[PDB]
Design a protein around this ligand. Structure first.
Ligand SMILES: Cc1ccc(C2CC2)c(-c2ccc3c(c2)CCCO3)c1[C@H](OC(C)(C)C)C(=O)O
Ligand SMILES: Cc1ccc(C2CC2)c(-c2ccc3c(c2)CCCO3)c1[C@H](OC(C)(C)C)C(=O)O
Ligand SMILES: [Mg+2]
Ligand SMILES: [Mg+2]
Lengths: 131, 131
């Protein structure tokens, strides 16, 4: 279903990478955050929900979503309730950039543009077809 | 044309808001940054280019794009070279959030979802039709 996203954090070089996957397409958005806090998750959810029609979010660590701030973001935005493949690409490009966050965005770019159509093409088509 | 984006910064409460507009659709993405630096622009461009097929970027301040770092981001990602309407929405929601960045993302959400189809629906349809 086109409104379903998966959200998890993974750890690399002492930092935290927030990873959202549009399950139907494999399309990813990621951000490096200082550490795993409800406030960072909430803010990320608000950002994500303004870009895509986010209906439901799943996670592999349900305690991620217990904070008052996360609950508020989901309430306002109308939301109801690959780490290895992305880490692979990050490793392939890591030497080309100083900052981990730079390498993360290169890896998201490479993943979303890779033809199996690409994840970036699939999400756009899935969402348009739903309209 | 579906690959064209506009990128500018605007100022509010002593902070800097980076605003990207998909010109064909009116769809917006925004981020609050500390101040206007080439590095922040470069990083934003890398993020944007992994989400959408960004072909060309325009700006109203051409000196925005002179830094070595911006040029590198455009090179790697294959890129070649409303402030009032968004400030209006930010003012309408500003009291509901502590942080300006939170109010900015609420305003992006409201803008992209507003039916004139919405900007969010238009960009997804324009991009899918181009495929
Ligand atoms: C810190 C820094 C300094 C200089 C550059 C470019 C040669 C000028 C880049 C950079 C700029 C763009 C770029 C890549 C690297 C690698 C390929 C993708 O595009 C970065 C970069 O940090 C940001 C925050 C992005 C400026 C990094 O972490 O090394
Ligand atoms: C700093 C802070 C504290 C508490 C909350 C929620 C009641 C718990 C929110 C919040 C959380 C979600 C939310 C809105 C506000 C307003 C409507 C949209 O959704 C924020 C918030 O900061 C972030 C970084 C987002 C946590 C802010 O700037 O006030
Ligand atoms: Mg997690
Ligand atoms: Mg500007």
């Amino acid at each position: 279903s086109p409104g379903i996203w998966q959200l998890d954090c993974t750890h690399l070089e002492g930092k935290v990478i927030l990873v959202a996957v549009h399950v139907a397409s494999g399309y990813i958005e990621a951000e490096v955050i200082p550490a795993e806090t409800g406030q960072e998750t909430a803010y990320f959810l608000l950002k994500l929900a303004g870009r895509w029609p986010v209906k439901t979010v799943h996670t592999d660590n349900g305690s991620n979503f217990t904070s008052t701030t996360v609950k508020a973001a989901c309430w306002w935005a109308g939301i109801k309730q690959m780490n290895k493949e992305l880490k692979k690409i990050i490793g392939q490009v890591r030497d080309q950039a100083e900052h981990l966050k730079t390498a993360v965005q290169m890896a998201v770019f490479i993943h979303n543009k890779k033809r199996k159509y690409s994840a970036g093409e699939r999400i756009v088509d899935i969402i348009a077809t739903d309209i």
